[PDB]
Design an enzyme around this catalytic site. Structure first.
Site, PDB file in Angstrom:
ATOM      1  N   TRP A   3       6.908   1.447   1.387  1.00 42.12           N
ATOM      2  CA  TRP A   3       7.942   2.382   0.175  1.00 42.12           C
ATOM      3  C   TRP A   3       6.748   3.602   0.452  1.00 42.12           C
ATOM      4  O   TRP A   3       5.685   3.952   1.127  1.00 42.12           O
ATOM      5  CB  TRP A   3       6.839   1.455  -1.567  1.00 42.12           C
ATOM      6  CG  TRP A   3       6.236   0.769  -1.322  1.00 42.12           C
ATOM      7  CD1 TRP A   3       4.820   2.095  -1.864  1.00 42.12           C
ATOM      8  CD2 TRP A   3       4.668  -0.301  -1.729  1.00 42.12           C
ATOM      9  NE1 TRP A   3       3.248   1.625  -1.564  1.00 42.12           N
ATOM     10  CE2 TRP A   3       3.532   0.167  -1.390  1.00 42.12           C
ATOM     11  CE3 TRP A   3       5.698  -1.756  -1.439  1.00 42.12           C
ATOM     12  CZ2 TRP A   3       2.495  -1.608  -1.620  1.00 42.12           C
ATOM     13  CZ3 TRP A   3       4.839  -2.668  -1.471  1.00 42.12           C
ATOM     14  CH2 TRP A   3       3.785  -2.410  -1.594  1.00 42.12           C
TER      15      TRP A   3
ATOM     16  N   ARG B 142      -2.148   0.137   5.167  1.00 44.99           N
ATOM     17  CA  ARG B 142      -2.082  -0.980   5.934  1.00 44.99           C
ATOM     18  C   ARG B 142      -3.551  -2.308   4.822  1.00 44.99           C
ATOM     19  O   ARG B 142      -3.601  -2.912   5.326  1.00 44.99           O
ATOM     20  CB  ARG B 142      -2.859  -0.780   7.104  1.00 44.99           C
ATOM     21  CG  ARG B 142      -2.234  -0.528   7.814  1.00 44.99           C
ATOM     22  CD  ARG B 142      -3.125   0.155   9.580  1.00 44.99           C
ATOM     23  NE  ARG B 142      -3.520   1.462  10.044  1.00 44.99           N
ATOM     24  CZ  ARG B 142      -4.576   2.069  10.567  1.00 44.99           C
ATOM     25  NH1 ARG B 142      -4.965   0.168  11.619  1.00 44.99           N
ATOM     26  NH2 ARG B 142      -5.012   3.179   9.740  1.00 44.99           N
TER      27      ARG B 142
ATOM     28  N   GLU C 222       4.420  12.681   1.117  1.00 43.02           N
ATOM     29  CA  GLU C 222       5.406  12.452   2.119  1.00 43.02           C
ATOM     30  C   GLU C 222       6.891  13.046   2.258  1.00 43.02           C
ATOM     31  O   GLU C 222       7.544  14.025   2.918  1.00 43.02           O
ATOM     32  CB  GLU C 222       6.203  10.655   2.952  1.00 43.02           C
ATOM     33  CG  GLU C 222       4.455   9.561   3.396  1.00 43.02           C
ATOM     34  CD  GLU C 222       5.363   8.635   3.655  1.00 43.02           C
ATOM     35  OE1 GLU C 222       4.714   7.937   2.287  1.00 43.02           O
ATOM     36  OE2 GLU C 222       5.499   7.782   4.313  1.00 43.02           O
TER      37      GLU C 222
ATOM     38  N   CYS D 279      -0.852   5.190  10.276  1.00 43.48           N
ATOM     39  CA  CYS D 279      -0.268   3.917   8.882  1.00 43.48           C
ATOM     40  C   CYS D 279      -1.919   3.845   7.873  1.00 43.48           C
ATOM     41  O   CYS D 279      -2.636   3.214   7.726  1.00 43.48           O
ATOM     42  CB  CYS D 279       0.124   3.182   8.547  1.00 43.48           C
ATOM     43  SG  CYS D 279       1.169   2.616   7.291  1.00 43.48           S
TER      44      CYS D 279
HETATM   45  C1  HEM Z   1       4.239  -0.351   1.929  1.00 44.41           C
HETATM   46  C2  HEM Z   1       3.999   0.786   2.001  1.00 44.41           C
HETATM   47  C3  HEM Z   1       3.854   2.004   3.530  1.00 44.41           C
HETATM   48  C4  HEM Z   1       3.016   3.396   2.619  1.00 44.41           C
HETATM   49  C5  HEM Z   1       2.226   3.830   1.569  1.00 44.41           C
HETATM   50  C6  HEM Z   1       2.926   3.738   4.163  1.00 44.41           C
HETATM   51  C7  HEM Z   1       2.639   5.357   4.829  1.00 44.41           C
HETATM   52  C8  HEM Z   1       2.304   5.697   5.424  1.00 44.41           C
HETATM   53  C9  HEM Z   1       1.918   6.994   5.801  1.00 44.41           C
HETATM   54  C10 HEM Z   1       1.871   7.986   5.236  1.00 44.41           C
HETATM   55  C11 HEM Z   1       2.699   7.402   7.472  1.00 44.41           C
HETATM   56  C12 HEM Z   1       1.946   8.334   7.747  1.00 44.41           C
HETATM   57  C13 HEM Z   1       4.226   8.736   7.407  1.00 44.41           C
HETATM   58  C14 HEM Z   1       3.914  10.288   8.130  1.00 44.41           C
HETATM   59  O1  HEM Z   1       3.468  11.624   8.120  1.00 44.41           O
HETATM   60  O2  HEM Z   1       5.499  11.006   8.449  1.00 44.41           O
HETATM   61  C15 HEM Z   1       2.396   5.880   8.034  1.00 44.41           C
HETATM   62  C16 HEM Z   1       2.908   5.344   8.778  1.00 44.41           C
HETATM   63  C17 HEM Z   1       3.119   4.374   9.871  1.00 44.41           C
HETATM   64  N1  HEM Z   1       3.458   3.385   8.686  1.00 44.41           N
HETATM   65 FE1  HEM Z   1       2.828   3.007   7.124  1.00 44.41          FE
HETATM   66  N2  HEM Z   1       2.876   2.679   5.269  1.00 44.41           N
HETATM   67  C18 HEM Z   1       3.643   1.210   4.625  1.00 44.41           C
HETATM   68  C19 HEM Z   1       4.646   0.934   5.243  1.00 44.41           C
HETATM   69  C20 HEM Z   1       4.636   0.155   6.454  1.00 44.41           C
HETATM   70  C21 HEM Z   1       5.212  -1.284   6.768  1.00 44.41           C
HETATM   71  C22 HEM Z   1       6.082  -2.156   5.959  1.00 44.41           C
HETATM   72  C23 HEM Z   1       4.984  -0.880   8.278  1.00 44.41           C
HETATM   73  C24 HEM Z   1       4.897  -1.509   9.318  1.00 44.41           C
HETATM   74  C25 HEM Z   1       5.201  -3.502   9.531  1.00 44.41           C
HETATM   75  C26 HEM Z   1       3.819   0.396   8.230  1.00 44.41           C
HETATM   76  C27 HEM Z   1       4.064   0.796   9.411  1.00 44.41           C
HETATM   77  C28 HEM Z   1       3.354   2.345   9.853  1.00 44.41           C
HETATM   78  C29 HEM Z   1       3.705   3.005  11.293  1.00 44.41           C
HETATM   79  C30 HEM Z   1       3.918   2.298  12.320  1.00 44.41           C
HETATM   80  C31 HEM Z   1       3.229   4.313  11.081  1.00 44.41           C
HETATM   81  C32 HEM Z   1       3.333   5.657  12.139  1.00 44.41           C
HETATM   82  C33 HEM Z   1       4.749   5.900  12.381  1.00 44.41           C
HETATM   83  C34 HEM Z   1       4.665   6.975  13.721  1.00 44.41           C
HETATM   84  O3  HEM Z   1       3.403   7.242  14.074  1.00 44.41           O
HETATM   85  O4  HEM Z   1       5.115   8.364  13.186  1.00 44.41           O
HETATM   86  N3  HEM Z   1       3.656   0.997   7.225  1.00 44.41           N
HETATM   87  N4  HEM Z   1       2.324   4.935   6.541  1.00 44.41           N
HETATM   88  N1  LIG Z   2       6.177   4.865   3.436  1.00 55.21           N
HETATM   89  C1  LIG Z   2       5.683   4.562   4.708  1.00 55.21           C
HETATM   90  N2  LIG Z   2       6.102   3.728   4.914  1.00 55.21           N
HETATM   91  N3  LIG Z   2       6.158   5.563   5.624  1.00 55.21           N
HETATM   92  C2  LIG Z   2       6.214   5.144   7.172  1.00 55.21           C
HETATM   93  C3  LIG Z   2       6.707   6.564   8.417  1.00 55.21           C
HETATM   94  C4  LIG Z   2       8.312   8.119   8.168  1.00 55.21           C
HETATM   95  C5  LIG Z   2       8.490   7.590   7.139  1.00 55.21           C
HETATM   96  C6  LIG Z   2       8.804   9.452   6.834  1.00 55.21           C
HETATM   97  N4  LIG Z   2       7.169  10.242   6.897  1.00 55.21           N
HETATM   98  C7  LIG Z   2       9.077  10.123   5.706  1.00 55.21           C
HETATM   99  O1  LIG Z   2       9.156  10.902   4.861  1.00 55.21           O
HETATM  100  O2  LIG Z   2      10.527   9.264   6.105  1.00 55.21           O
END
Ligand code: HEM
Ligand SMILES: N=C(N)NCCCC[C@H](N)C(=O)O
Ligand code: HEM
Ligand SMILES: N=C(N)NCCCC[C@H](N)C(=O)O
Ligand SMILES: C[As](C)(=O)[O-]
Ligand SMILES: C[As](C)(=O)[O-]
Ligand SMILES: [Zn+2]
EC number: 1.14.13.39
Lengths: 416, 414
Positions: free
Chosen positions: A292, A123, A297, A120
């Protein structure tokens, strides 16, 4: 010097040492022999169904550790409340084989899990998570109510707020609470006769699964799927999301007038619903979370991956680019405009979103905060660097150590 | 034991069994993955003041020789047996041995083939190997380097090449090429910390002026070479301009681009790495191929710590550099890369774009899957610096591990 991994930033020439990884109590896919760090799903964290209750001995040390992290976090480590809470957990595992978390502990762990997520890039927002406690939930119908409440609070009419809803943990020999859908919001993937897929190819399996469960499938390119919710020891039930709750953004380009005619769109709420939330040994099989989007993405992965909507060629043809030669960088040009379109369309719709530049910059800020607060930050490079303009972002030039810390979000096998 | 490798674009899977042959450790451990790190903290190439445990050297040697004979379908032959005994013989007596020209040629090619960070490995079988082990002076290294450059450049129709100088000898100093590449632009630190030229070469530039080189004052001043023979001070040699081919950069449609006065050299020739074959080390083995457009257009010209020309181009393109969401960086990076491709094609100098380059690498993976049951690859280095997921390699999982022969980083001679 220091006996921990030396991490360097090649843009700034600065150096740091990660001592936090010494806290990692779980192995990954790597070995001195070969690096498997690019594998998406290496059989490591994988929380395979372990039906027969866990080693009371193993769960204890995992619980003893989480409770320490909790008291540590509230600066009361070694206190009487800490020891008492410690004896309390042991006793409860002694007689029941499992144990439960106090309200505040659940909130603390949910946040730590996000905080600990190596993939993520957002974070820096980790301390601002709304934790909905739905551990009282006892029906697929009730799950649907919480989920709707989640989507309503999380969407907030475009001013998106991060959130997570926690359903009942796994119990000795009992069925798990599971959300069959990978995301609360997904578009249908229809397998065509000629072999192609209409809509989103990533969601073909889940799409057929809904059909097999009574959903009357549509035939659009952007059909919002229904949710398959499964309560303990029961077949999953079907639920259709009130269209008004699912906020969507039609895509238009700021200057290419024809782009809007493509009829492309995307939902505003990214809500992973198939991951497993693990805290102090306890496993929450259903715990959908949302934040968000980061523009790439949607703009690069969702709309341009070869195995997704794959719209690159269509857009490039509309831009009148020479798509018969790689050297015209027609793919690069169309990808930019498409990403621009996504950003522009969300801003116009006043729906929260962040571009890959702003996002990575803030992640660099987060790495600095974490270096000070914990002596490091687990990060998966391939996942942190954006799918376009990689080296143009600051994270590209930042080495990263990847490892697993708990609480944590882990992948889990499909319920079917 | 055998890692499953998946391609998320096609859903295909393969098992890497080649990694079992890995006899060298990486920086990764089950506790944490350090794969994103560029240089090894310990996998270095420590000094050679005393011979290397004959036990060790001998085993690497027997393995390499075995490798060499399998390659020519004469394994277990008579020659093979008598070669192993020669090596056994020399080692026991002198503490080291020497390779035959044909083994060297084989080893050099394998080192490139095993290069985890190289995207152009589909060409591994086409490498011109110049034996320069018959070198005793820095003046000689210079003539060798000049011939390599002439041949490699071939008036724009670039041809891959490597020149191998004398192997390391215990207790004796190394033949070294101080410069990181045979062709680099000087980096002149001004007064107020800013830099004119290539910020990446500030140090090598300073070392040159410190050995009698008269510095220029431009952004693209071709640096001289600091060649060093064993236990001697490095010597300075200027390269004949007619030998250093360069490409002025201009844009297809943006008439103004040429104004910027940007340019780049045609020959990417790394010279600070070490070639290891059968336990023998070649501290000075300069190698070259041709450029992939992104190395120049994205990394060398747009990196913040390099020429960092991103903002200038954007302003000339009259883009909104006020905000990030305007994607002015992404838009300008794209034109600069287009200009490199255009400029190189116009000048009839070999170059490969990242789309074509990664497509060919995918073929190489397949070719290697059948030939050896795997291919060591470093994802972070194989996927291009722009348009990552727009290429096939992004969607391909990869296994990284060290195989020998191999090219390795080595300490800086100063
Ligand atoms: C507030 C805005 C946030 C942004 C912009 C963000 C953005 C991202 C992005 C770009 C990825 C990788 C997406 C992909 O390549 O499929 C990611 C992965 C992840 N995010 Fe965040 N994130 C946010 C919020 C959250 C929240 C609220 C949580 C959890 C409470 C979280 C947990 C994770 C986890 C667990 C992954 C990895 C998921 C996987 O292995 O496919 N994210 N996030
Ligand atoms: N922005 C956040 N929280 N992303 C979490 C990852 C899963 C979303 C996915 N990559 C998609 O493009 O739907
Ligand atoms: C035929 C044209 C070639 C192309 C297009 C090509 C392209 C590349 C690229 C893009 C990289 C990464 C460069 C960077 O990011 O700094 C790379 C790395 C590398 N290549 Fe190639 N390559 C070619 C020929 C060769 C040859 C002939 C050799 C050796 C005989 C070779 C050995 C290597 C090695 C050892 C690395 C890693 C260097 C390091 O660790 O910094 N390549 N190549
Ligand atoms: N194309 C080749 N052979 N590359 C090898 C690497 C060194 C070139 C370096 N990346 C540069 O941009 O100068
Ligand atoms: C613009 As459409 C073809
Ligand atoms: C081209 As200048 C502004
Ligand atoms: Zn690794």
């Amino acid at each position: 010097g220091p006996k921990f991994p030396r991490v360097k930033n090649w843009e700034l020439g600065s150096i740091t040492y990660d001592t936090l990884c010494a806290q990692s109590q779980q192995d990954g896919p790597c070995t001195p022999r070969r690096c498997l760090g690019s594998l998406v799903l290496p059989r490591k964290l994988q929380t395979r169904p372990s039906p027969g209750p866990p080693p009371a001995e193993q769960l204890l040390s995992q619980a003893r550790d989480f409770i320490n992290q909790y008291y540590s976090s509230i600066k009361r480590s070694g206190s009487q409340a800490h020891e008492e809470r410690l004896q309390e957990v042991e006793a409860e595992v002694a007689s029941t084989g499992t144990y439960h978390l106090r309200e505040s502990e659940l909130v603390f762990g949910a946040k730590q899990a996000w905080r600990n997520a190596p993939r993520c890039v957002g974070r820096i927002q980790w301390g601002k998570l709304q934790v909905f406690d739905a551990r009282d939930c006892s029906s697929a119908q009730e799950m649907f109510t919480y989920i709707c409440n989640h989507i309503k609070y999380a969407t907030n009419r475009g001013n998106l707020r991060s959130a997570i809803t926690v359903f009942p943990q796994r119990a000795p020999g009992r069925g798990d609470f599971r959300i069959w859908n990978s995301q609360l919001v997904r578009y249908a993937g229809y397998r065509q006769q000629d072999g192609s897929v209409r809509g989103d190819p990533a969601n073909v399996e889940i799409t057929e699964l809904c059909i097999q469960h009574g959903w009357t499938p549509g035939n659009g390119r952007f059909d919002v799927l229904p949710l398959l919710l499964q309560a303990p020891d029961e077949a999953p039930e079907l639920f259709v999301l009130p269209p008004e709750l699912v906020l969507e953004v039609p895509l238009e380009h700021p200057t290419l007038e024809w782009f809007a005619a493509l009829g492309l769109r995307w939902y505003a709420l990214p809500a992973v619903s198939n991951m497993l939330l693990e805290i102090g040994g306890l496993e929450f099989s259903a715990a959908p979370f949302s934040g968000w989007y980061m523009s790439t993405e949607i703009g690069t992965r969702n709309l341009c991956d070869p195995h997704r909507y794959n719209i690159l060629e269509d857009v490039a043809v509309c831009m009148d680019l020479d798509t018969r030669t790689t050297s015209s960088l027609w793919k690069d040009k169309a990808a930019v405009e498409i990403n621009l379109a996504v950003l522009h369309s969300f801003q116009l719709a006043k729906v929260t979103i962040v571009d890959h530049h702003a996002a990575t910059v803030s992640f660099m800020k987060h790495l600095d905060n974490e270096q000070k607060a914990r002596g490091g930050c687990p990060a998966d490079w391939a996942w942190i660097v954006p799918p376009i303009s990689g080296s143009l972002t600051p994270v590209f030039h930042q080495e990263m150590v990847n490892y697993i810390l708990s609480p944590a979000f882990r992948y889990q096998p499909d319920p079917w």
